Structure formats: structure tokens, C-alpha cells
Ligand binder design. Structure first.
Ligand SMILES: O=c1ccn([C@@H]2O[C@H](CO)[C@@H](O)[C@H]2OP(=O)(O)O)c(=O)[nH]1
Length: 124
């Protein structure tokens, strides 16, 4: 089965592009990565850095998670990311998203052994 680590890679990693996400990027990606299967995932972020660089965040700045848990980490350096937010008129199964590129510090929750990212908490 798909591990939590694998799920994080499927939902949040897109190293390929150095970040040139077209206005259509999210519509394509959210569907291709199976994030609009049962419903339109409201918010989802894709990170364009290498897997190694993102995994390394689990050893960076320990910060509180939005849910109160203590296992979140903020990247010291900013990272190339693309935020996908469902449009107000999005109608499942026809999920529509607004694509927004940015360079911010990411905050991810890490778990397991190896200690790797399993949830994308926020970008700041
Ligand atoms: O900036 C943000 C904030 C949230 N999320 C994803 O949306 C879920 C609900 O907030 C968050 O749980 C998280 O999905 P998860 O990683 O848990 O699958 C983002 O992707 N980026």
C-alpha cells in the first residue's frame, strides 16, 4: 500500500519544473496526482525543490503545527512552490483551481523512521 511518506510525495512534490506553473498547472496537477478523486481538495501545495532538500526540512526549524502537534518544521531557506486553491465556482467532478507561484519557507509535519515529511502544514 501507499505509505504516508509516499502520499506526501504524490500530493506535494513536483521537482521536475523549476517552477513555471502555467495558469492551468493546478487544474492539470490536482487531477493527475489524484487529488480530485472523491472530492476537490480545497488547498494543496506543490514544492519544486529536490526530494532531498524537502526531506531535509525535517531536521530544520522545529515549530508548532497548526493543529497543536509539535512535529512541524520550517525550512530555513525559501523554496519554490505553487499553491493550488479551488475557485469559488469549482464544481466537482470538474474541479477548478487558481494557480499561484511563490518563494516561501515551507512548514511540514514529519513522522516515522526514517523521519520524513507526511503533511504540508503551511508556507510563510
Ligand atoms: O498551505 C497549505 C495548507 C494546507 N495544505 C493541505 O490542505 C490540508 C488542509 O489545510 C492540509 O492537511 C494539507 O494537506 P495534507 O498535506 O495534510 O495532505 C497544503 O497543501 N498547503
Amino acid at each position: 500500500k501507499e505509505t504516508a511518506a509516499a502520499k506526501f510525495e504524490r500530493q506535494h512534490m513536483d521537482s521536475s519544473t523549476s517552477a513555471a506553473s502555467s495558469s492551468n498547472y493546478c487544474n492539470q496537477m490536482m487531477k493527475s496526482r489524484n487529488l480530485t478523486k472523491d472530492r476537490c481538495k480545497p488547498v494543496n501545495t506543490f514544492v519544486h525543490e529536490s526530494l532531498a532538500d524537502v526531506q531535509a526540512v525535517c531536521s530544520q526549524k522545529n515549530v508548532a503545527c497548526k493543529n497543536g502537534q509539535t512535529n512541524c518544521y520550517q525550512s530555513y531557506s525559501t523554496m519554490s512552490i505553487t499553491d493550488c486553491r479551488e475557485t469559488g465556482s469549482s464544481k466537482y467532478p470538474n474541479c477548478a483551481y487558481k494557480t499561484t507561484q511563490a518563494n516561501k519557507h515551507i512548514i511540514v509535519a514529519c513522522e516515522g523512521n526514517p523521519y520524513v515529511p507526511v503533511h504540508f502544514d503551511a508556507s510563510v
